[PDB]
């Protein structure tokens, strides 16, 4: 029903609740190019990216779905990359995703080691490591610099 | 605390070099809870600027207990904006003292956060919604 889930389903990724690793019908590069060309061909071409990330962020307002979305995914057909990494592989989506991630990161200043001893902030910044291509250095640079200045001691 | 806290913060052109010492003072393990309470009472009487926000946030980080009356004073001054430091202060109060926050205080926080220039607007929005 949401733009996000439907585009993901057509493009060929199973969005699971948040308990087990998201399944993957397709190859990762295949997935990326599939959703890329899907949003390319789709009318209202420049605005679906914004709508998409808003649907995404509204999806990851609940913790557990995002927790599974962060973790490495399961290929059905043997151990793969995470969906977030793959989606940031697409240049057009990248700055929006970065924006969202950093804006919502300070929720997790004080909730360290909640349930499964998984440090959400460490994981989220780990998502940004080892990127193929950086669409914006200036925006990422400035955003991480704002971020670093503020955080409490351990996380900073 | 009473002799040095007020004139340094109220001195004009007070900077990081001054605030770092005040942060260190409020962080002393030897600053007993009641002494922390006294320091809080003293800070509340100062005019509120970015330097006050930093020191207040540092002191509030120790999870110091507060009577509802003092907490009310804190919230009143709190609810009356463009800086990230104010945002961090507001977030800390909204998160560690949630049990004390009344509906009026929640709305007061909401109003002081309204503008979008403030940093971490979305997280503040989330914390606020969590208090509802």
Coordinates of C-alpha atoms in Angstrom, one line a residue:
Chain A
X1 CA 0.0 0.0 0.0
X2 CA 2.9 2.4 0.7
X3 CA 5.0 3.6 -2.2
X4 CA 8.1 2.1 -0.5
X5 CA 6.9 -1.4 0.2
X6 CA 5.3 -1.7 -3.3
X7 CA 8.4 -0.5 -5.1
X8 CA 10.5 -2.9 -3.0
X9 CA 8.2 -5.8 -3.7
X10 CA 8.1 -5.2 -7.5
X11 CA 11.9 -4.6 -7.5
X12 CA 12.3 -8.0 -5.7
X13 CA 13.1 -7.6 -2.0
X14 CA 11.0 -9.2 0.8
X15 CA 10.5 -6.6 3.7
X16 CA 10.0 -8.9 6.7
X17 CA 8.5 -7.6 10.0
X18 CA 11.9 -7.0 11.7
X19 CA 12.5 -10.3 13.5
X20 CA 14.4 -12.2 10.7
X21 CA 16.7 -11.2 7.9
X22 CA 15.0 -9.7 4.9
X23 CA 15.0 -12.2 2.0
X24 CA 16.3 -11.4 -1.4
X25 CA 14.8 -12.7 -4.6
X26 CA 17.4 -11.0 -6.9
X27 CA 21.1 -10.2 -7.2
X28 CA 22.1 -7.0 -5.4
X29 CA 23.3 -5.1 -8.4
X30 CA 20.1 -6.4 -10.2
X31 CA 17.9 -5.1 -7.3
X32 CA 19.6 -1.7 -7.5
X33 CA 19.3 -1.3 -11.2
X34 CA 15.7 -2.6 -11.0
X35 CA 14.5 -0.1 -8.5
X36 CA 16.6 2.6 -10.3
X37 CA 15.0 2.0 -13.7
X38 CA 11.6 1.6 -12.0
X39 CA 11.8 5.1 -10.4
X40 CA 13.4 6.3 -13.6
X41 CA 10.5 5.3 -15.8
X42 CA 7.8 6.2 -13.3
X43 CA 5.8 9.4 -13.9
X44 CA 6.3 12.2 -11.4
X45 CA 9.9 11.3 -11.9
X46 CA 11.7 13.8 -9.6
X47 CA 9.2 13.7 -6.7
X48 CA 8.9 9.9 -6.2
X49 CA 12.4 9.9 -4.6
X50 CA 11.3 12.3 -1.9
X51 CA 8.0 10.4 -1.5
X52 CA 10.0 7.1 -1.3
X53 CA 12.3 8.3 1.4
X54 CA 9.4 9.8 3.4
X55 CA 7.6 6.4 3.2
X56 CA 10.9 4.7 4.2
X57 CA 11.5 7.0 7.2
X58 CA 7.8 6.6 8.3
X59 CA 8.5 2.8 8.0
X60 CA 11.7 3.1 10.2
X61 CA 9.9 5.1 12.9
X62 CA 9.3 1.7 14.5
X63 CA 12.6 0.4 15.8
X64 CA 12.6 -3.3 15.0
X65 CA 11.9 -3.0 11.2
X66 CA 14.8 -0.6 11.0
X67 CA 17.0 -3.0 13.1
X68 CA 16.4 -5.8 10.6
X69 CA 16.7 -3.3 7.7
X70 CA 20.2 -2.4 9.0
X71 CA 21.4 -6.0 9.3
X72 CA 22.8 -8.0 6.4
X73 CA 20.2 -9.7 4.3
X74 CA 19.4 -13.3 3.4
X75 CA 19.7 -14.7 -0.1
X76 CA 17.2 -17.5 -0.7
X77 CA 19.0 -19.2 -3.7
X78 CA 24.9 -17.6 0.6
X79 CA 25.3 -14.5 2.8
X80 CA 24.8 -11.0 1.4
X81 CA 24.9 -7.2 2.0
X82 CA 22.3 -5.1 3.9
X83 CA 19.4 -3.4 2.0
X84 CA 20.3 0.0 3.4
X85 CA 23.8 -0.2 1.9
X86 CA 22.4 -1.3 -1.4
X87 CA 19.9 1.5 -1.4
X88 CA 22.6 4.1 -0.7
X89 CA 24.5 2.5 -3.6
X90 CA 21.9 4.4 -5.8
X91 CA 23.2 8.0 -6.1
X92 CA 19.8 9.7 -6.5
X93 CA 18.6 8.4 -3.2
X94 CA 21.8 8.9 -1.2
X95 CA 21.6 12.4 0.2
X96 CA 18.0 11.9 1.3
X97 CA 18.9 8.7 3.1
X98 CA 21.9 10.3 4.7
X99 CA 19.7 13.2 5.9
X100 CA 17.1 10.9 7.4
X101 CA 19.7 8.6 9.1
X102 CA 21.5 11.5 10.8
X103 CA 18.4 13.3 11.8
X104 CA 17.0 10.3 13.5
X105 CA 20.4 9.1 15.0
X106 CA 20.2 11.3 18.2
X107 CA 17.2 9.3 19.4
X108 CA 19.8 6.7 20.4
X109 CA 22.1 8.8 22.6
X110 CA 20.9 7.2 25.9
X111 CA 19.4 3.9 24.9
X112 CA 22.6 1.9 24.6
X113 CA 22.4 -2.0 24.9
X114 CA 18.6 -2.3 24.9
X115 CA 17.6 -5.8 24.1
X116 CA 20.1 -8.0 22.1
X117 CA 23.2 -6.0 23.2
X118 CA 23.2 -4.3 19.7
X119 CA 24.5 -0.7 19.8
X120 CA 22.2 1.0 17.2
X121 CA 24.3 4.1 16.8
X122 CA 27.5 2.1 16.1
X123 CA 25.6 0.1 13.5
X124 CA 24.1 3.1 11.8
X125 CA 27.3 4.9 11.4
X126 CA 28.8 1.6 10.2
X127 CA 26.2 1.7 7.4
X128 CA 28.1 4.6 5.9
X129 CA 31.5 3.0 5.9
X130 CA 33.1 1.7 2.6
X131 CA 30.8 3.5 0.2
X132 CA 31.5 3.0 -3.5
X133 CA 30.6 6.5 -4.4
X134 CA 29.9 9.7 -2.4
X135 CA 27.3 11.8 -4.2
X136 CA 27.9 14.7 -1.7
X137 CA 31.2 15.1 0.3
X138 CA 30.3 18.7 1.4
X139 CA 26.9 17.6 2.8
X140 CA 28.1 14.4 4.4
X141 CA 31.2 16.3 5.8
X142 CA 29.2 19.1 7.3
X143 CA 26.5 16.8 8.6
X144 CA 28.9 14.5 10.4
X145 CA 30.7 17.6 11.8
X146 CA 27.5 19.0 13.2
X147 CA 26.8 15.5 14.6
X148 CA 30.3 15.0 16.2
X149 CA 30.2 18.3 18.0
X150 CA 27.1 17.5 20.0
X151 CA 27.1 13.8 20.9
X152 CA 27.7 12.4 24.4
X153 CA 31.2 11.2 25.2
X154 CA 31.2 7.5 24.3
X155 CA 29.3 7.9 21.1
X156 CA 31.2 11.0 20.0
Chain B
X1 CA 29.8 27.5 43.4
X2 CA 27.8 30.5 44.7
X3 CA 30.8 32.8 44.6
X4 CA 32.2 31.9 41.1
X5 CA 29.3 30.4 39.2
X6 CA 27.2 33.7 38.8
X7 CA 29.9 36.3 37.9
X8 CA 31.7 34.2 35.4
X9 CA 28.6 33.3 33.4
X10 CA 27.2 36.8 33.8
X11 CA 30.5 38.3 32.7
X12 CA 30.4 39.5 29.1
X13 CA 32.3 37.6 26.4
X14 CA 32.3 34.4 28.4
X15 CA 33.6 31.6 26.2
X16 CA 34.5 27.9 26.0
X17 CA 37.6 28.5 28.2
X18 CA 35.2 29.4 31.1
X19 CA 32.4 26.9 30.4
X20 CA 34.8 23.9 30.4
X21 CA 35.6 24.5 34.0
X22 CA 32.0 24.8 35.0
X23 CA 31.2 21.6 33.2
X24 CA 34.1 19.9 35.0
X25 CA 32.8 21.3 38.4
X26 CA 29.3 19.9 37.8
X27 CA 30.8 16.6 36.8
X28 CA 32.8 16.0 40.1
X29 CA 31.9 12.7 41.7
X30 CA 32.4 14.6 45.0
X31 CA 29.6 16.9 44.0
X32 CA 27.0 15.2 46.3
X33 CA 23.4 15.0 45.1
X34 CA 22.2 17.8 47.5
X35 CA 25.1 20.0 46.4
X36 CA 24.1 19.3 42.8
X37 CA 20.5 20.4 43.8
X38 CA 22.0 23.6 45.2
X39 CA 24.0 24.2 42.0
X40 CA 20.8 23.7 40.0
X41 CA 19.0 26.3 42.2
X42 CA 21.8 28.7 41.6
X43 CA 21.9 28.2 37.8
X44 CA 18.1 28.8 37.6
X45 CA 18.6 32.4 38.7
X46 CA 21.0 33.4 35.9
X47 CA 19.9 34.8 32.6
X48 CA 19.7 32.0 30.1
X49 CA 22.1 32.0 27.1
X50 CA 24.0 29.3 25.3
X51 CA 26.6 29.1 28.1
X52 CA 23.9 28.5 30.7
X53 CA 22.4 25.7 28.5
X54 CA 25.8 23.9 28.3
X55 CA 26.3 23.9 32.0
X56 CA 22.7 23.0 32.8
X57 CA 22.9 20.1 30.4
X58 CA 26.1 18.9 32.0
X59 CA 24.6 19.0 35.4
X60 CA 21.3 17.4 34.3
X61 CA 23.3 14.6 32.8
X62 CA 24.0 13.2 36.3
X63 CA 20.2 12.4 36.8
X64 CA 19.9 14.7 39.7
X65 CA 16.5 14.4 41.6
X66 CA 14.3 17.5 41.6
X67 CA 11.1 18.4 43.6
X68 CA 8.1 19.0 41.3
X69 CA 8.3 22.8 42.3
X70 CA 12.0 23.1 41.2
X71 CA 11.2 20.9 38.2
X72 CA 8.4 23.3 37.4
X73 CA 10.8 26.3 37.6
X74 CA 13.2 24.5 35.3
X75 CA 10.5 23.7 32.8
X76 CA 9.1 27.2 32.9
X77 CA 12.5 28.8 32.1
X78 CA 13.0 25.9 29.5
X79 CA 9.7 26.6 27.7
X80 CA 10.6 30.3 27.0
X81 CA 15.5 28.5 20.8
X82 CA 17.4 28.6 17.5
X83 CA 20.5 26.8 19.0
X84 CA 21.5 23.1 19.0
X85 CA 22.6 23.4 22.7
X86 CA 19.0 24.4 23.7
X87 CA 17.8 21.4 21.7
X88 CA 20.2 19.0 23.5
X89 CA 19.1 20.4 26.9
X90 CA 15.4 20.0 26.0
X91 CA 16.0 16.5 24.8
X92 CA 17.8 15.5 28.0
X93 CA 15.0 16.8 30.2
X94 CA 12.3 15.2 27.9
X95 CA 14.1 11.8 28.1
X96 CA 15.6 11.3 31.7
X97 CA 12.8 13.1 33.6
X98 CA 9.8 11.9 31.6
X99 CA 8.1 10.6 34.8
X100 CA 7.8 14.2 36.1
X101 CA 6.6 15.9 32.9
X102 CA 2.9 17.1 33.0
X103 CA 0.8 17.8 30.0
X104 CA 1.3 21.6 30.3
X105 CA 5.0 21.1 30.3
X106 CA 4.9 18.8 27.3
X107 CA 3.0 21.5 25.3
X108 CA 5.4 24.1 26.6
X109 CA 8.3 22.0 25.2
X110 CA 6.4 21.6 21.9
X111 CA 6.0 25.4 21.5
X112 CA 9.6 26.2 22.3
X113 CA 10.7 23.6 19.7
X114 CA 8.2 24.7 16.9
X115 CA 10.8 26.5 14.6
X116 CA 12.7 24.3 12.1
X117 CA 16.1 26.1 12.5
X118 CA 16.8 24.1 15.7
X119 CA 18.9 21.0 15.2
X120 CA 17.6 17.5 15.7
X121 CA 14.0 18.7 15.2
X122 CA 12.7 15.2 14.3
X123 CA 14.2 13.5 17.3
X124 CA 12.7 16.2 19.5
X125 CA 9.4 15.5 17.8
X126 CA 9.8 11.8 18.5
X127 CA 10.5 12.3 22.2
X128 CA 7.6 14.7 22.5
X129 CA 5.2 12.3 20.8
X130 CA 6.6 9.6 23.2
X131 CA 5.6 11.8 26.1
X132 CA 2.0 11.9 24.8

